[PDB]
Amino acid sequence: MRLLYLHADRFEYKTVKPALKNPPDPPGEASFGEALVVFTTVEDGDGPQTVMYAASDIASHSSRLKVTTVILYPYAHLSSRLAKPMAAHKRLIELEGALRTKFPGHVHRAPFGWYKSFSIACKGHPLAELSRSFTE
Amino acid sequence: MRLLYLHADRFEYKTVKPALKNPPDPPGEASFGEALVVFTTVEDGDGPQTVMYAASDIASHSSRLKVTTVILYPYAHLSSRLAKPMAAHKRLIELEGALRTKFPGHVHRAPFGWYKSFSIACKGHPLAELSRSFTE
Ligand SMILES: C[C@@H](O)[C@H](N)C(=O)N[C@H]1[C@@H](O)[C@H](n2cnc3c(N)ncnc32)O[C@@H]1CO
Ligand SMILES: C[C@@H](O)[C@H](N)C(=O)N[C@H]1[C@@H](O)[C@H](n2cnc3c(N)ncnc32)O[C@@H]1CO
């Protein structure tokens, strides 16, 4: 699992066209205030332990930033070892569930399988932008 | 070299604090209209051939999108095999020079060595967001 932690003053996205033949999440759109935006690439070989590591780190980083909103934003472009679409959608479902057990704020899981337009205003401070890898 | 091609309706950034002890580029800020924003991570082992590959692909992708502006945005977070700061600044200088020989539009090299705040409005269409690796 490759992740990118963007501490944003603002985030919003809208799904456009389907990217997979059968996108497992309905289309949609959302906009946010301050939020840690976690760009998430599920990698071939992520399982439950990977998920719990990532959940723990996401919650601890958020606590550091004092953020109360976390967006889990599926992203196919952070690495060159992706899990297949089905497996990836499952791990993201589990990652959302797992993060709720470690983080008291708002957790928003963005839809998986769509091309999306997004806007972000990413903060300029030293820890606004960090990358993370998790494995098992 | 790891790259991320973000086809944006809009982009802007401002440098905040220094990130290296001696940032080789002066501080600054800029804002743009439509533009391909190339998030660039220089990897340990990039040389001249890597640069020319990336320049060729950047120019050809831009031609596909019919964009006329390309931002080369140094980014330390796309991979886990970075070149050292000096080497990376050099390759980005060369990448900017090389891209001018293949792409007729505006090429903006963002400053290297700063923490930055940025805003992007990234397009929703099928090729608005692509990743690329180049090696030699
Ligand atoms: C394209 C860009 O605008 C958008 N943001 C996008 O990347 N959409 C992805 C994810 O939502 C999802 N997806 C497929 N594989 C994966 C994976 N291994 N890990 C996470 N998501 C995946 O399916 C879409 C196409 O790959
Ligand atoms: C932090 C985030 O807001 C900002 N956008 C940032 O990443 N700043 C980077 C690059 O500008 C540059 N830099 C250092 N190493 C590299 C490298 N190997 N490749 C490209 N740039 C590098 O030095 C800064 C700190 O790593």
UniProtKB/Swiss-Prot annotation, chains A, B:
Subcellular location: Cytoplasm
Recorded superkingdom: Archaea
Domain notes: The N-terminal domain (about residues 1-140) is an archaea-specific tRNA-editing domain that has a highly similar structure to Dtd (D-aminoacyl-tRNA deacylase). Editing of incorrectly charged L-seryl-tRNA(Thr) by this domain is tRNA catalyzed.
Subunit structure and binding partners: Probably interacts with its catalytic subunit.
Miscellaneous comment as given in the Swiss-Prot or TrEMBL entry: There are two ThrRS in this archaeon. The first one (APE_0809.1, AC Q9YDW0) is most similar to bacterial ThrRS but it lacks the N-terminal editing domain. The second one (APE_0117.1, this entry) is most similar to archaeal ThrRS but lacks the central catalytic domain; it probably does not aminoacylate tRNA(Thr).
Gene that encodes it: thrS2
Coiled-coil region: none
Protein task: Freestanding tRNA editing subunit of threonine--tRNA ligase, the catalytic subunit is probably AC Q9YDW0. Deacylates (edits) mischarged L-seryl-tRNA(Thr) in trans; has no activity on correctly charged L-threonyl-tRNA(Thr). Probably does not aminoacylate tRNA(Thr). Deacylates correctly charged glycyl-tRNA(Gly), but not glycyl-tRNA(Gly)(2'-dA76) (the terminal 2'-OH of tRNA adenine 76 has been dehydroxylated) nor the 2'-fluoro tRNA derivative, strongly suggesting the editing function is catalyzed by the 2'-OH of A76 of tRNA(Thr).
Official protein name in the record: Threonine--tRNA ligase editing subunit
Family statement drawn from the similarity comment of this UniProt entry: Belongs to the class-II aminoacyl-tRNA synthetase family. Archaea-specific ThrRS editing domain subfamily.
